[PDB]
């Protein structure tokens, strides 16, 4: 996971990537979450970093913040990489515009 967000890694997670969070089944009864990375939040402590993701399920918009080093998630998979249209580290401004995420699971399954 450190290499996943390592600033020294060209192929790191950036705002705009759509990712899937997979939870460990033995430790919790959660379901995988597909979300659009609004922000990668890194702090002084490496273990205490988080992902802010967004997804418009049907017509209800949810955003989820996950601790990237919580032992309840095994891995996070990149479903589709970001595009160069957006021009910031944190894409908060997409909320409510034509840049907004939409139904990611439906789009992927299309």
């Amino acid at each position: 996971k450190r290499k996943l967000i390592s600033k020294k890694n060209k192929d790191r997670l950036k705002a705009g990537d759509v990712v899937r969070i997979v939870y460990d089944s033995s430790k919790c009864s959660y379901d995988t979450f597909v979300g659009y990375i609004l922000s990668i939040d890194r702090k002084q402590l490496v273990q205490d970093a988080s992902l802010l993701l967004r997804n418009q399920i049907a017509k209800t918009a949810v955003e989820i913040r996950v601790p990237l080093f919580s032992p309840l998630i095994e891995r996070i998979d990149l479903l589709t990489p970001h595009v160069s249209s957006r021009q910031r580290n944190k894409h908060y401004y997409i909320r409510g515009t034509r840049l907004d995420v939409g139904d990611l699971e439906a789009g992927l399954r299309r």
Partner: protein, 290 residues
Amino acid sequence: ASTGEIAKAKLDEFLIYHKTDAKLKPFIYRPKNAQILLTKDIRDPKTREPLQPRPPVKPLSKQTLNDFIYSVEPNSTELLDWFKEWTGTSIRKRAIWTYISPIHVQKMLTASFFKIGKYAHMVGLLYGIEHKFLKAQNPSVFDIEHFFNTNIMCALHRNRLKDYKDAEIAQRKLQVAWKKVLNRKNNTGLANILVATLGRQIGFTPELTGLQPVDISLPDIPNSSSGAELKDLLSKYEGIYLIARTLLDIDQHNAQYLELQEFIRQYQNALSESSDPYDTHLKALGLLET
């Protein structure tokens, strides 16, 4: 991880590659398409799980088969059923049927006859697959020198160390062997000596049709002392050496023949590094049967 095991893995991956769907091969074996495979997420046979990535696949070398054949265990489906599973493929696919070469028949025969001990299974398998090969447009594999001559080698091996006196059955078996042969290339190796030996052993008079009286002129092995060249030169003539060894061991009329023994001596000169495979197989068969 034995050499036979790694060869089995290689040929298994080869046959899996050829048996997988054509439209799917680009998304199973082309690393450039890994992300596309991840996105489109195909299911496995009977929808077991998503398709797994695999590396590219290159042609398969010939030695991978005979290597395991010689380095087989006393009994296992891994080699017992390999021929059946390999031939249980559509004649349409070309690689699976063109990989088999005429020089592999006498390779498979030895392991079943000596180490595995279930030679009846292989002899049984070599019946319904003849016409399948004919459709697969590769009929040259069952030739004379590597298939007919080796068949009579195995037949005489059966008759020796065991009790055999059925002249009528011997005649019928010779005739059906001639039937099974479907590629007429008569070379240095001559089966006239063998058929005469079986005839005098079992009381039956040699009878065949279309056979040629080609004199035995096995290429003499030189006095080379090289490495890879030496071992390859020995490898390309291993079989006829075994033919000559069986002839010397059994045929007492072999005195008039001189090419066989001189070729044997030259091959042994080339083989000074190891022992004689003919008596090696004799020992293996004796200890496994007793």
